[PDB]
Every structure is written in C-alpha cells, then in structure tokens.
Design a protein around this ligand. Structure first.
Ligand code: NAG
Ligand code: NAG
Ligand code: NAG
Ligand code: NAG
Lengths: 550, 50
C-alpha cells in the first residue's frame, strides 16, 4: 500500500558515494512495494540500510552489486516478480559485494522471507566473504524454468534444526522451504507437509491457511482481498440458454486489481482499465466514461509515444524518430525531450535534432501519458509548437508527474495556448531561469483531482517579471496567460474572436459583421447583407437568422 | 578496485559528463559514474527533488 518506482540504472551510480547512498535512501525508504527495480550498488561499509526492511515486494528485479556493507536487511522481502530482468535473465543478482583489497564485504543475506521469484533466475557469485548463501535451495524459491539458478570457504555450519539450509548461523535463520516440502497433492506452495497444509493455487510466496484470502502475495490479481486469476467479467455465459448475460457483480481490471471503477483518465475496454485503444477501435465518451468503440470508417491519427509500440526502445524524441510524428493528433504514450535528443547522441550515431522539425507537433491535440521537457533548442523561447495541445491525460506518470519543464534557460514564456486539461499527475516547472508567465497561471483550473499538486521553483522571480513588464494582457481573466498578447489567455475578461480576446464583437462596424454567442464572436452568414447605420447584420447563426438577404 | 576505465571508443557512451567504466569479471560489464545533476543507465536523465 506504500508504492515507489525504483531505478533503472543497472551498475551505473553517482560519483559522490554519499550522494549515491543518499539517493538509495531517497528512492526506497518507507516503500513496501517497489514497482520496478531495487538497485543497491556502490554502497560503503559504514552505511545504515535498516530502511530496506520496509520492502515486502519487487515488481522487476533485485540488483545488489559492488557494495562493501556486511549485511543486506531485506528481512521483509517475500516476492520478486521479475516482470523485467537484469541482463534479461536474472530476477536476483548479488555479485562483487566486497573490496578487491580484501578488508570488508557482504557476509550475510537477510532474505528469510524471500520464498518466491515468479520469473527469472538467480545469480549469486563473486562475493568473497558471503556465508550460508551456498546452503540455499533456490530451486524451491524460483517458481518456473531459468537455466541459470546457482551460488558460487571458512564459513560456519548451519544450525542443527536448519537441516543444512540457512541464511545465517542461528536456529532462527533456517530457510523456509515452501514448495519441495509439500504433500504430493499440493500444486502450489504450503505451510506444512500434509494435504491440510496446501496453499490456494493463486497464492504467491506462501499462505497462513487454505483460502485464496490467506495468501502472502497474489499470483495474478487482487479482488477485495481474494487472489483471483482474472476479474469478474461484464458478461457471463449461461449454459442452458447458450447466450452471454450481464454480470452485475463485474469488476474492472486495473493493474493487479479488480476495481469497482476505472480512474477517470483511463479508457474502458472489456472489463479492463487500459491506457490506449487498440489500433482498430477509437476512444469515445459516454456519460463521462472513455471507451473503446469501433471506428466510424477511418480511425483517428493516434501515434506511438516515447516508450510505446514502435517506439518501445526510445527514451527521447530525436532526429531518428521526429518524422514518426507527421500529422499526429493524439500521442498514445509520452513525449520526452532529453539532452541527448535535442543535442544528439554521438555514441549511437544520432545527429542533433533540426529545430524546424519540432513543428510536427503543431497537429498534436492530446498526449495520453506525460510531457517531459528536459532539453530544448537554445534559439527557441517557448513551446508554441504545442499551440494545439488541449489535454495531458497522465495515464502514465514520471515520478507522479504529468508535466515537466526543467533546466531550460532559453525559454521566456510557455505558450501552451490551447491547453485546458491535465487529468492526472503533478506539474514540475523548475530551474528555467528566464521563464516569465508561469506565476500568473491558476494551474488548479487545469486539474481534475484535488490530489494534483504544482512544484514551481527557481524560475524568474515574479517580482522581476512584473518590473520588466512581462505581464498578462488586460483582456485576460484572473486565471492568467501562457505568454504575452491577447491570444495567450487562460480565459477572457470580456469577448473572444477565435483564439484572441477582444472588448466587443463587430456588431455595428467592421469588415465581417458578427453576433455574440455569449462571449464568442461568430461571423454572420455570407448571405446576410452588411447592415449600416447602427443596425445588426444578423441575430444568430445561419441564413435563417439574417436581417436582410444580400 | 573491480573497475577499469573504458576505451576512447566508449567515451561518448556516458552522456552529460558521465565517466565510463568496465568490470574485470569473465562478457565484460559496463557502467557510468554520474555527476550529481544526472542519472539513468548512461547519465541521460536529470536528477530531481521536492
Ligand atoms: C515475513 O512474512 C510474514 C507473513 O507474510 C510476516 O508475518 C512477517 O512480518 C515477515 N516475517 C519476519 C520474521 O519478518
Ligand atoms: C489484497 O488487497 C487488500 C486491499 O484491497 C489488502 O488488504 C491485502 O493485502 C491483499 N492480499 C494480498 C495477498 O496481497
Ligand atoms: C499530412 O497531411 C497533409 C494534409 O493535412 C498532406 O499534405 C500530407 O501528405 C500528409 N503527410 C504525411 C507525411 O503523412
Ligand atoms: C483558481 O484559484 C482560486 C483562487 O482565486 C481557487 O478558488 C480555484 O480553485 C480556481 N478558481 C476557479 C474559479 O476555478
């Protein structure tokens, strides 16, 4: 119930070893479920790791390498799911945890509760001072074959009660076998050796009893405390009628859960909370609920975002993929601009992006995931290329954020002109030393949830902006503006002609006469005759609402 | 140390001022040592707080 993201650094770390330690603490303290990888690399001998006792579960892999500390306190870790593996093979990798000099290193693993490794193998090798780990029956902990499950002197023997398999020297250090020791009738795990003691087939880790509500962890989905293979579907087959019937106890699949409702920003397909519609279907709203329905004739231009489908491999928009965005109106995924995207990645022979090519985004109206701007061409002062962007769904978040604009010196205004909705996630606009209009925006008007925060730090001081005349146009409401001019408001103080706020419509004078559709100035039908001498040309839309016909 | 510096070919491997390192073990494992401002497998991402 206290979830964190975890790193994807592998063996990479910070040069400052205290900063490396401080980062480990930052990322993983008070976290129960690591929703990704638990990477513990390059940690000094002295260091306190007691905070790791918080960890119960790891979604991806566990990498413990190049450290010098005596003991690994993952005493509450039960399951490693191995959804993503180290070197695409190991769910658990513990290696080189000593100093080559030969002073100190890892001596004991506190994994007495690690009874499940769902996918992947175990690589415990090159740990000069590690004891007892050799005695571990990993074959019991790994649920499926993984042609890599092995452990590679002057070590104490296991306690008598341990049966030669233990994590440490004491009688309280015995390895709890939960699979090989079961009755020939258990198909899963067990808490004893008789048929009475088998776990439900859906229990991961182990159990405290026979029911699907007695699990330590779920193999698949959690439906109100019950470990299920699938959620109750919306339809149910009746065997006597040979027809599908409505199941009114149906629940929606969201992540590893059966939920009474999908998050508002997510789409509903089947009895499931998805992030994107299949290429064949199109997103439609029915009583506030986004759903996948078949296309009228031709499906809208939805494009793979950075880290999705055709761009799964991608980490940033670059010269090699900028052209995959021609004519996109919707981005199924994220848009990320990293330093190596804008300024090129020489090692992988990718040239710096052509700043003109960033105009491909002028067609983009929606970004379903997140917008992450960590780099931008220096000659570009704003994000006017995103002048048509209306929604950021936040169906995917980067550290809980749906909007990131950081370290950008060249930007002086934002210019997200069409922007009206940031459905989920928080905003992080920091260290853009010359940015100036951000402080006027009532970001709250863009949010859907009340849990949505805003982190605005170290941009140009609001006082400095005001003194240099970087203020909103008088026709802007108290909600703010994206940059200078009347076209850049969040809402108008009076009337509006298209994207620009004005004082009054062309009711009695002007090239094209207009009627007021309550603050929106709409041009009279071309058939209406231009009425002079204080007369209105039209009193509504269409040729029926004319004053005189031309 | 278990680590050695990379060749000049693998200089551009770590970006944003990251220092490349290889591991002496018998394939060879590569890693980046990042400046406090950056992270990721190749120091490609900015570090962030608050
Ligand atoms: C290990 O798991 C059990 C049940 O899942 C829990 O009682 C406990 O706090 C953890 N046990 C120890 C000895 O830390
Ligand atoms: C399943 O979910 C409930 C919350 O809905 C939680 O109290 C319980 O920990 C869960 N059971 C397992 C085995 O994860
Ligand atoms: C994009 O659409 C325009 C018109 O809206 C058309 O001229 C062009 O062929 C399209 N180009 C690509 C590369 O999809
Ligand atoms: C704008 O911020 C205000 C303070 O004036 C807060 O009431 C509100 O949630 C947003 N106001 C409106 C009228 O949407």
């Amino acid at each position: 119930q206290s979830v964190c993201a975890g790193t994807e650094n592998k063996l990479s770390s910070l040069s400052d070893l205290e900063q490396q330690y401080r980062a480990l603490r930052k990322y993983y303290e008070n976290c129960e479920v690591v929703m990704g990888n638990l990477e513990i690399t390059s940690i000094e001998h002295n260091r306190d790791l007691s905070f790791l006792r918080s960890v119960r579960e790891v979604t991806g892999y566990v990498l413990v390498a190049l450290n010098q500390f005596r003991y690994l306190p993952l005493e509450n870790l039960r399951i490693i799911r191995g959804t993503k593996l180290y070197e695409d093979r190991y769910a658990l990798a513990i290696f080189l945890n000593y100093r080559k000099d030969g002073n100190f290193g890892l001596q004991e693993l506190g994994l007495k509760n690690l009874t499940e490794i769902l996918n992947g193998g175990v690589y415990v090798d090159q740990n000069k001072f590690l004891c007892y780990a050799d005695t571990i029956h990993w074959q019991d902990i790994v649920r499926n074959p993984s042609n890599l499950t092995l452990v590679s002197s002057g070590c104490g023997r296991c306690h008598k009660s341990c049966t030669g398999r233990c994590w440490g020297p004491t009688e309280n250090h015995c390895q709890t076998l939960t699979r090989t020791v079961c009755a020939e009738q258990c198909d899963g795990r067990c808490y004893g050796p008789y048929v009475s003691d088998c776990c439900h087939r859906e229990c991961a880790g182990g159990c405290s009893g026979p029911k699907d509500t007695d699990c330590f962890a779920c193999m698949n989905f959690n439906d109100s405390g019950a470990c299920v293979t699938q959620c109750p579907q919306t339809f149910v087959y009746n065997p006597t009628t040979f027809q599908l019937e409505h199941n009114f106890n149906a629940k929606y699949t969201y992540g590893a859960f059966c939920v009474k409702k999908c998050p508002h920003n997510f789409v509903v397909d089947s009895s499931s909370c998805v992030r994107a519609c299949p290429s064949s279907k199109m997103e439609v709203e029915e009583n506030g609920i986004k759903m996948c329905k078949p296309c009228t004739d031709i499906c809208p231009k939805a494009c793979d975002g950075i880290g999705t489908g055709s761009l799964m491999s991608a980490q940033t928009v670059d010269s090699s993929n900028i052209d995959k965005f021609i004519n996109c109106t919707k981005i199924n995924g994220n848009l990320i601009f990293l330093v190596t995207g804008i300024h090129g990645d020489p090692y992988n022979a990718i040239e710096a992006i052509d700043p003109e090519k960033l105009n491909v985004f002028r067609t983009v109206r929606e970004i379903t995931g997140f917008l992450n701007i960590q780099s931008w061409p220096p000659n570009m002062t704003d994000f006017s290329v995103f002048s048509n962007l209306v929604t950021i769904g936040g169906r995917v978040l980067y550290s809980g954020l749906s909007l990131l604009i950081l370290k950008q010196q060249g930007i002086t205004s934002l210019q997200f002109q069409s922007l009206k909705e940031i459905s989920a996630g928080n905003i992080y606009i920091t260290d853009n030393s010359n940015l100036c209009y951000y402080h006027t925006i009532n970001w709250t008007t863009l949010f859907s949830t009340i849990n949505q925060r805003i982190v605005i730090r170290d941009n140009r001081k609001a006082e400095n902006c005001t003194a240099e005349g970087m203020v909103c146009n008088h026709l802007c409401s108290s909600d703010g503006c994206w940059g200078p001019g009347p076209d850049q408001c969040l809402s108008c103080r009076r009337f509006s002609r298209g994207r620009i706020c004005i004082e009054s419509c062309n009711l009695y004078d002007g090239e094209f006469r207009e009627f007021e559709n309550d603050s929106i100035c709409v041009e009279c039908d071309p058939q209406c005759e231009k009425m002079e001498d204080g007369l209105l040309t039209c009193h509504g839309p269409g040729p029926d609402n004319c004053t005189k016909c031309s | 140390s278990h680590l050695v510096k990379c060749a000049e070919k693998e200089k551009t491997f770590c970006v944003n001022g990251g220092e490349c390192f290889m591991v002496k073990d018998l394939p060879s494992r590569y890693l980046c040592k990042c400046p406090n401002e950056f992270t990721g497998d190749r120091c490609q991402n900015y570090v962030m707080a608050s």
